[PDB]
Design a protein around this ligand. Structure first.
Ligand SMILES: [Mg+2]
Ligand SMILES: [Mg+2]
Ligand SMILES: [Mg+2]
Ligand SMILES: [Mg+2]
Ligand SMILES: [Mg+2]
Ligand SMILES: [Mg+2]
Ligand SMILES: [Mg+2]
Ligand SMILES: [Mg+2]
Ligand SMILES: [Mg+2]
Ligand SMILES: [Mg+2]
Lengths: 132, 133, 101, 128, 509, 37, 72, 195, 304
RNA sequence: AAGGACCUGGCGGUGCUUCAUAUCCCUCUAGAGGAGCCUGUUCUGUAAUCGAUAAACCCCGAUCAACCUCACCACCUCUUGCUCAGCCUAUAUACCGCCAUCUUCAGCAAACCCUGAUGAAGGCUACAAAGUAAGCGCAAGUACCCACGUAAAGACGUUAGGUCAAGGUGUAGCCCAUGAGGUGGCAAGAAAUGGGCUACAUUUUCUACCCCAGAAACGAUAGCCCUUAUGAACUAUAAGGGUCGAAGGUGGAUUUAGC
């Protein structure tokens, strides 16, 4: 009995998504990595910097778009350029959506001194993999 | 229907100096996914063959590194948890490749990287002898 | 706003060691060298002895960044084993698989 | 620290202790219960200590057919907004915690004279 | 609203970074980039020399006032003639009692004022204040540049035949050799005049071409606009068509900041002239090279696309409609859709209107019934395609769904009285109970009509004695024309059923 | 530096854009404690 | 990996050959021995530039010139 | 309150410029992508997750951009710019004859804001003395000097330069080192004559 | 239900779009083309096909579900619907009718296979009942339609060869015949060229076995192939090896020698060699060491 | 309250039958309780951490303690104290997070129906008698060299199992302190026990090669002295050299690991 990145089986009234439903020993087998960088590979460096910075990215964006997201994020770092992909709900107005998008992109670019872009996919209700 | 009339071509100048002669452009792609590596190498070899240069494809073995962590927090020495980082190599060699051809090809590929890949260039260029010798 | 006062002290020690790094290297060379006068070696010895505290690179420790745990920290990742397992389970990081070989 | 901070639901779980040792065996506890609460739903994401007026999220972006500009909420207006939010939270807590009046039947603490309402309509459709 | 909110968020980020630089002070990125570095508009400690040098860096006026104060009151010295010239440049660019005060404080400076200082004062007094002051400053200058004399010329201008003549003459006489921006400005001032300067503009432009400086980017278009007009001038239109055809054939280079009005007023002239070859050429203009930056403002782009598609509609129209279906990208305003529907009417392509209305509804066609009424009238003036009656009923139902949104606005009340007739006829043309009860609701809200009489009659004959009577007799008791129709309706079989409703018919008749 | 990180997030909370659930939890329990003495 | 950071147009000989920097002592003494080993290490080290290398050298100069009381 | 328009699936035609609608690398955007491609572990009596909320297709690297048509188009576009290799050079022996001195550097490229990494400074070079020395005395001298920098099986002498951080500095130092080595091997000394 | 046709038509449209993408005439287009296109346009490191990206036809995506078995009103269509297992009931009824018909006249199919063939589950007990009825029907004569009915369920045996591969002989200079083979081991890999016309001495990386293997068990293993075949001094062999262990290299050389000799020697003798068991790579390898164990299988002593 | 009969579980040094895979044995091998050494535990004293401390801890937190690691202690200082404070202060019997356990398991089960006079409860007879089942787990598939095998996984729940000392948090406290800062030592063994290393022999010891040879008839990873590795700091941490050349003669019950 191991408790690691898994939801308890309930009576069947708990909507759960793919990534948080599947176990952490099924990551490479039936999942993908949220982030993708080369610091983990051999020859690269600053892997600790990559990890801390991307964790801070996820935290700051999750908390500056609170209540709109319903799943983990997708980070994609090609050389210099950084890309983020999110899945959100149609909770608030496109005005606020675009304002916060530009605000966060500008702040992150100014902070990390790096070209950054982010995309968002709207959903009426969060997709559920199963009822556990 | 909207097809542009006059294509704006960038300026080009053939400077006075001769272009450098790269003997061999040997690129090595490190990745985590065999399928991503296959797609990337197919892309590269197709671009190279359409540009009109020689090619050759090899597949070095898979390298893996593992290290053991304590499964629990306070007191458990029998039970551990393990991980493994798998890096997969792919080689691509190009012989008899001009300096400017190398420039254009490397610009193309360096813009056409995917994310979860590292790329190591080894450039081999021949030159004549010095004058002081 | 560091994690705790021990992390505060560790960072102070690291900064002091950095800002006295080159000088300590030079005087340590002047000490451990042998063909030079042993009187000069002793001079440099009391120089190092009079150097301030928290200045040596030996008092610092490779502690964790998140949980400030000194033990079980990898030099590459700089993260505790527990936080590493956490992130590996949550799939936050990249390119780490379970060694089920 | 900020890196030490984390999401809300795990803190709520650790604070409520819904599925610890105490809940098992039916031992329970001495009639103490921590009620669930959600702070994100309450306040809109706009206001804070520094009362900058945001045409994008806080203030309507267009007024009189003219784009707006970032401005400051004065001290008195900020304090008024703070008092209004205090009153709103107090009203929310009052509406949350209230009495429950199930009709006293045979006696108090007894399920004798209470009715559950009509039956549930059947699948094929049968209202009772 | 969306993209201007994006720009507002960009400005907000600028505000945060310039209010708290120390957070973004760390240089994490390897290549150092000052655009990414925080900007620092912070005055340093008091130092008159470097403070005056920093005046040109901070780009404001309170610092300049304070520096003039410090240099005049206790110092009484000039740090540099170039520094004073830069201060005057800033003060004239920033300029209204404030401008008056600035102008009266540009006379407290030291006597070290030269052609540059005097001419920048002239520039400021022209482009920020009255023109008599600039004229006096220039008389003083004579008693003692291109853009300076430009300012002076437009100040004198803004009937004045002798003034214009002497101005042009002595300006060309002097050895300034302007870059024709003076000519552009005097054209801007000559925006309106009769032939006695419209035609001389052509010879002035021929002289421009002879000297060979201007690309004919702004003055040419301004004279095109000045051609504006009780009668279109086809001769001049063809001449300018050839000229701008050569302009399009050659590649363009931007030199004049007023090229934004070029696009919009050009397309306005396009809508006035109304020629297909003219439209082709003006499209090729921006479609030749990297000239599509001249569109710029959304208002000018809107006017351009509107008039472009309008002329294309009012020119077969299959090429036009497929061009549109390919190149909508934003959703255009009603006007263009109106011209589209008129073109589709004259073309007789009935099957295309449903798709266009569906596109408009999908994008932004809500809470307005002008285009709905237009579509309904144009489509039920037709009844030719029998299999298309299903699509008639479908689009009618969709139009009614769009109608019934919320009454609080009260605007949906007058839409049935205007266009319910065609809608209900389309519904009648397969399922008909919806049309029956919808005509019921219409009359139970009325404004009867002859087309409504035809609708009632065809519905009654296609439909059951009692079912038809309970409509026709009721509408007859309501109004008289349905009674003159009921006189004919009651002949076949309606009368023998029951007599009380026939008695009501006789009474109402 | 946690210095920069936490100071930035604190100032931004004061601006009122980042709804910090952890900080809300904390300050709410502190309000409760100061109410209960 | 070198677009920028040219080391102020420094040169390989300025990095490695410190013979011109080493002039104020004979070629046999123990200070000569130590400073020769110092120059060797500096030339071997690519991380530091000629500025830091001459800083090392001049600091050693000051060291043994203010400790010139011995010269043993 | 607000509604989202239907995706571009029905809007996009079968004849369509995919390289134009996807010029550069971008996310999957299933709303714009008409393909119903799904990816996910199907449930018993179920199917993989639809492309609507399939964030795993985003997790995995993305290659919708740069279709074969796009690759062809860009290759024919850049064919104008690429140059031709000298036809006289068609063999290793001929290339080594035309330009004996081989030299090669190397460096990685990795995701991240920073780009420098000290391995950029290293540069190796190779030359065989079978044709360059033209003598025997200096040959024996230099082969005695060099300990392991030579290879007598394949007949190549190889030397590495990293003592400087700059690649150009390493290049210049390597060439000057070879020059001074040849100049010092040309001559000899009395203890070298007496052996 | 209409969603099925919607997905089918949309999948056809997407197939046409993908054909236009990859640049092929959308008419002639195949499932392998679809697979290669999706693999190139959206790679994935997932190991299981269940999780890998797959662009499949909806008929094969969605599993078969029993459509409405009763009309909009009244009775159901089939005459067993009021009880479950109606299709299998009708099948058993038909099989029993055929059985009694033959009475008056006078490989197998997987349970899961029948499960996906029908639209209802069942048990091992009635599955065995059905198999018993099949075998009882088959014990006696069987008509043409009856045999075809049984063969509809009976599947292909898919028997293997049960044979050791035969390498082709090769010819090199001076008209010399030979045969090359390769063998492996735990960590040793070798390749051996057997020369028939030559005989006597054996070469190993240019060194003779007598002094390459100071111990004699390795040479005995090298002799075992020649010894069993009984041709000892009538064939010579060269060999190159790369391995760590002496016995490992010995076994690798033995396997390569046998794999090269099976080519020259007749197929009956190859069968005899297979019966001897010297033509199969040893699947046994040093087991992995476990984190909690002291070794591969041994655990720490039970401390109690 | 007592009492009579019943429902469920546990228990039986409980009957019959079938089994025990390295587990029960008879069996096969190698080991632990013999002597020395390394490293934990109990215990003695010190001003001198803490926690687990049967199975399911004892080379355990610790894949490190000469100084931070230091949380103990003596001495000397700060009082909004890096923290819009801080606290390794108590509560693992509030918890989250993380794991042992049966598990070398296969059951756990929302939702319906039925039986028992509509009781606790149960629902098994296939040549079939009331059970039907969402879902989880198992399984399957995935990783390595396969399809076997090894890894991985192993649910519901017991031990209020361990962990407020990875980290946070509920409650109760210090908030001139029970917080914070800088010097030192603390970290030894009259003793008992545990896991591992060494050898107690000639399958040994030495010499070149890793296996065709020649000799002896062995054993210090402890202590004393010296050298070397890094450190600011080697009395001693680690490695090497000279000397010391014993205990030890193959184990006092019993017991551990292995197909
Ligand atoms: Mg476990
Ligand atoms: Mg240390
Ligand atoms: Mg009561
Ligand atoms: Mg310590
Ligand atoms: Mg304390
Ligand atoms: Mg407990
Ligand atoms: Mg399984
Ligand atoms: Mg396991
Ligand atoms: Mg307990
Ligand atoms: Mg030391």
């Amino acid at each position: 009995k191991n408790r690691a990145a898994r939801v308890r089986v309930s009576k069947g009234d708990k909507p759960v998504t793919y990534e948080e439903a599947h176990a952490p020993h099924y990551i490479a087998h039936r999942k993908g990595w949220l982030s993708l960088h080369t610091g983990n590979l051999d020859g690269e460096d600053h892997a600790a910097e990559r990890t801390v910075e991307d964790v801070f990215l996820r935290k700051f964006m999750w908390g500056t778009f609170p209540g709109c997201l319903a799943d983990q994020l997708v980070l994609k770092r090609r050389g210099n350029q950084l890309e983020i992909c999110a899945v959100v709900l149609r909770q608030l107005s496109p005005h606020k959506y675009y304002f916060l998008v530009g605000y966060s992109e500008t702040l992150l670019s100014y902070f990390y001194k790096c070209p950054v872009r982010l995309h968002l996919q709207t959903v009426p209700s969060k997709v559920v993999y199963k009822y556990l | 229907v909207d097809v542009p009339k006059d294509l704006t071509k960038p300026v080009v100048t053939i400077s006075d100096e001769p272009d450098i002669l790269y003997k061999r452009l040997s690129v090595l792609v490190k990745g985590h996914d065999k399928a991503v590596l296959d797609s990337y190498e197919y892309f590269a070899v197709l671009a190279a063959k359409e540009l009109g240069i020689s090619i050759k494809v090899h597949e070095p073995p898979r390298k893996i590194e593992r290290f053991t962590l304590l499964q629990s927090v306070h007191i458990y020495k029998k039970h551990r948890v393990q991980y493994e980082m798998r890096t997969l190599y792919r080689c691509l060699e190009l012989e008899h490749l001009t300096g400017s051809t190398a420039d254009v090809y490397l610009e193309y590929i360096q813009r056409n990287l995917p994310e979860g890949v590292a790329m190591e260039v080894t450039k081999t260029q021949l030159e004549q002898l010095p004058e002081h010798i | 706003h560091y994690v705790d006062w021990r992390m505060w002290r560790d960072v102070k020690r690291r900064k002091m060691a950095y800002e006295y790094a080159d000088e300590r290297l030079r005087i340590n060379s002047l000490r451990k060298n042998t063909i030079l006068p042993k009187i000069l070696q002793d001079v440099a010895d009391e120089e190092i002895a009079a150097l301030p505290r928290d200045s040596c690179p030996v008092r610092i420790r490779n502690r964790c960044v998140m949980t400030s745990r000194p033990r079980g920290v990898k030099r590459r990742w700089r993260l505790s084993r527990i936080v590493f397992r956490h992130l590996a389970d949550h799939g936050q990081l990249s390119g780490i698989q379970r060694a089920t070989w | 620290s900020f890196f030490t901070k984390l999401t809300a639901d795990e803190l709520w779980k650790g604070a409520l202790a819904e599925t610890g040792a105490g809940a098992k065996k039916g031992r329970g506890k001495r009639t103490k219960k921590k009620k669930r609460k959600d702070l994100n739903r309450g306040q809109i994401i706009g206001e804070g200590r520094y009362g900058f007026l945001w045409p994008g999220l806080n203030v309507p972006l267009m007024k009189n057919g003219a784009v707006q500009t970032i401005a400051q909420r004065s001290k008195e207006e900020q304090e008024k907004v703070e008092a209004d939010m205090i009153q709103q939270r107090e009203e929310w807590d009052r509406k949350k915690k209230m009495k429950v009046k199930r009709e006293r039947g045979w006696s108090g603490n007894s399920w004798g004279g209470i009715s559950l309402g009509p039956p549930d309509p059947g699948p094929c459709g049968e209202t009772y | 609203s969306f993209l201007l909110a994006k720009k507002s968020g960009e400005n907000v980020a600028k505000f945060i970074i310039n209010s708290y630089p120390k957070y973004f002070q760390k240089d994490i990125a390897e290549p150092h980039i000052p655009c990414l570095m925080p900007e620092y508009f912070e005055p340093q400690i008091k130092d008159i020399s470097e403070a005056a040098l920093k005046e040109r860096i901070e780009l404001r006026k309170v610092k300049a006032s304070v520096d003039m104060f410090d240099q005049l009151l206790q110092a009484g010295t000039t740090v540099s003639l170039e520094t004073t010239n830069s201060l005057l440049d800033l003060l004239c660019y920033y300029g209204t009692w404030r401008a008056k005060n600035n102008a009266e404080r540009i006379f407290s400076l030291m006597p070290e004022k030269n052609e540059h200082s005097y001419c920048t004062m002239i520039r400021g007094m022209v482009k920020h204040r009255a023109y008599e002051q600039a004229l006096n400053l220039y008389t003083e200058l004579l008693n003692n540049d291109v853009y300076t004399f430009n300012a002076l010329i437009e100040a004198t201008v803004c009937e004045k035949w002798s003034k214009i003549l002497e101005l042009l003459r002595h300006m060309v006489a002097q050895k300034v050799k302007p870059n024709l921006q003076t000519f552009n400005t005097i054209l801007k001032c000559l925006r309106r005049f009769h032939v006695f300067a419209r035609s001389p503009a052509l010879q002035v432009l021929r002289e421009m071409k002879a000297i060979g400086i201007e690309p004919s980017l702004a003055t040419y278009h301004h004279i095109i606009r000045l051609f504006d007009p009780g009668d279109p001038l086809k001769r001049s239109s063809f001449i300018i068509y050839d000229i701008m055809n050569e302009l399009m054939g050659k590649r363009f280079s931007p030199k004049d900041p007023d090229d934004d009005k070029f696009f919009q007023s050009a397309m306005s002239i396009c809508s006035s002239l109304r020629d297909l070859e003219l439209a082709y050429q003006v499209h090729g203009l921006l479609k030749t090279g990297d000239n599509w930056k001249f569109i710029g403002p959304d208002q000018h782009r809107n006017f351009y696309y509107s008039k472009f598609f309008d002329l294309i509609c009012l020119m077969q129209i299959d090429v036009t409609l497929k061009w549109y279906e390919d190149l909508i990208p934003y959703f255009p305003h009603s006007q263009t859709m109106i011209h589209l529907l008129q073109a589709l009417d004259v073309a007789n392509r009935l099957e295309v209107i449903p798709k266009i209305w569906k596109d408009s509804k999908e994008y932004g066609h809500t809470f307005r019934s002008d285009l709905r009424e237009e579509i309904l009238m144009l489509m039920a003036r037709d009844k030719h395609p029998p299999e298309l009656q299903v699509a008639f009923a479908d689009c009618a139902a969709d139009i009614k769904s769009a109608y019934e949104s919320q009454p609080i606005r009260q605007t949906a009340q007058d839409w049935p009285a205007t266009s319910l007739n065609c809608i209900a006829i389309l519904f009648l043309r397969g399922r008909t109970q919806e049309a029956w009860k919808m005509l019921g609701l219409f009359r139970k809200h009325k404004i009867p009509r002859s087309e409504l009489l035809n609708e009632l009659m065809d519905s009654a004959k296609v439909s059951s004695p009692s079912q038809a009577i309970e409509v026709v007799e009721l509408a007859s008791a309501f109004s008289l024309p349905i009674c003159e129709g009921l006189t004919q309706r009651v002949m076949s079989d309606f009368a023998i059923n029951q007599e009380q409703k026939e008695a009501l018919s006789n009474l109402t008749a | 530096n946690h210095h920069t990180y936490a100071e930035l997030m604190q100032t931004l909370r004061f601006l009122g854009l980042y709804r910090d659930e952890h900080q809300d939890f904390m300050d709410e329990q502190k309000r409760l404690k100061k109410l209960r003495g | 990996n070198e677009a920028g950071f040219d080391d102020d147009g420094s040169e390989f000989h300025e990095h490695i050959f410190l013979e011109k920097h080493l002039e104020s002592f004979p070629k046999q003494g123990p200070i000569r021995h130590f400073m020769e080993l110092v120059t060797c290490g500096l030339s071997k080290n690519p991380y530091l530039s000629v500025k830091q290398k001459v800083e090392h050298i001049e600091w050693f100069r000051n060291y043994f010139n203010e400790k010139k009381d011995i010269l043993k | 309150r607000r509604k989202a328009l239907p995706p571009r699936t029905e809007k996009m035609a079968v004849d369509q410029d995919w390289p134009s609608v996807y010029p550069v690398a971008a996310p999957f955007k299933p709303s714009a992508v008409p393909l119903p491609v799904r990816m996910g572990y199907p449930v018993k009596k179920g199917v993989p997750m639809a492309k609507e909320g399939n964030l795993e297709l985003l997790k995995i690297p993305n290659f919708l951009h740069l279709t074969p048509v796009a690759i062809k188009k860009h290759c024919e576009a850049l064919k104008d710019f690429c140059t031709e290799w000298p036809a006289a050079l068609d063999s290793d022996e001929k290339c080594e004859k035309h330009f004996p001195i081989e030299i090669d550097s190397t460096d990685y490229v990795s995701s991240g804001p920073s780009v420098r990494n000290p391995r950029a400074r290293v540069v190796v070079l190779r030359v065989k003395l079978s044709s360059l020395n033209l003598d025997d005395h200096a040959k024996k001298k230099l082969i005695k000097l060099v300990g392991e920098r030579y290879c007598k099986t394949t007949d190549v002498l190889t030397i590495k330069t990293d003592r400087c951080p700059l690649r150009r500095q390493n290049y210049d130092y390597a060439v000057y080192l070879l020059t001074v080595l040849y100049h010092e091997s040309w001559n000899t000394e009395e203890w070298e004559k007496s052996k | 239900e209409d969603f099925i046709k919607k997905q089918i038509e949309e999948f056809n449209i997407g197939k046409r779009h993908l054909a236009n993408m990859m640049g092929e005439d959308p008419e002639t287009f195949t499932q392998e083309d679809i697979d290669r296109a999706i693999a190139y346009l959206f790679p994935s490191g997932l190991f299981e096909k269940r999780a890998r990206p797959v662009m499949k036809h909806p008929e094969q995506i969605f599993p078969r579900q029993r459509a409405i078995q009763w009309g909009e009103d009244g009775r159901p269509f089939h005459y067993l619907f009021y009880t479950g297992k109606q299709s299998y009931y009708s099948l058993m009824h038909d099989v029993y009718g055929m059985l009694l018909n033959l009475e008056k006249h006078q490989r197998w199919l997987i349970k899961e296979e029948l499960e996906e063939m029908l639209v209802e589950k069942l048990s091992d007990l009635d599955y065995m009942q059905f198999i018993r009825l099949l075998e009882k029907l088959l014990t006696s004569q069987c008509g043409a339609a009856e045999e075809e009915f049984v063969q509809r369920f009976r599947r292909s045996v898919t028997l293997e060869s049960k044979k050791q591969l035969i390498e082709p002989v090769q010819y090199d200079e001076q008209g010399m015949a030979f045969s090359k083979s390769e063998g492996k081991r735990k960590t040793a890999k070798a390749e051996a060229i057997v020369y028939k016309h030559g005989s006597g001495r054996i070469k190993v990386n240019g060194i003779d076995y007598q002094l390459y293997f100071p111990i004699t068990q390795d040479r005995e293993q090298l002799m075992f192939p020649f010894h069993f075949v009984d041709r000892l001094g009538k064939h010579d062999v060269t060999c190159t090896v790369s391995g760590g262990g002496r016995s490992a290299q010995a076994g690798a050389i033995r396997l390569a020698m046998a794999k090269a000799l099976c080519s020259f020697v007749t197929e009956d003798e190859v069968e005899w060699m297979r019966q001897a068991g010297l033509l199969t790579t040893d699947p046994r390898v040093r087991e992995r060491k476990k984190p909690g164990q002291e070794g591969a299988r041994r655990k720490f002593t039970w401390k109690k």
